[PDB]
Swiss-Prot record, chain A:
This is Spike protein S1. It comes from the Viruses. Changing residue 22 to P: Increased resistance to human covalescent sera neutralization. Residues 22-44 are annotated as: Disordered. Attaches the virion to the cell membrane by interacting with host receptor, initiating the infection. The major receptor is host ACE2. When S2/S2' has been cleaved, binding to the receptor triggers direct fusion at the cell membrane. When S2/S2' has not been cleaved, binding to the receptor results in internalization of the virus by endocytosis using host TFRC and GRM2 and leading to fusion of the virion membrane with the host endosomal membrane. Alternatively, may use NRP1/NRP2 and integrin as entry receptors. It comes from Severe acute respiratory syndrome coronavirus 2 (2019-nCoV).
Amino acid sequence: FQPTNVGYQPYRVVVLSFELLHAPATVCGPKKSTNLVKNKCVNFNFNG
Amino acid sequence: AYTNSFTRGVYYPDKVFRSSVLHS
């Protein structure tokens, strides 16, 4: 690595690996939660 | 010493509810 090097330049890397397990969820997107409505037909999103 | 395990030591393979069913 020297600054004059593109295939020989330093690249920083981050890899995000996501677990979509059957467990309770633990890291969420910023979507605002809302009240439950039973017995009516609804579009829903529980944990994704 | 040694012994027969019998049919002990089964466990829930995943955190998913299932009922009245046979699952492989």
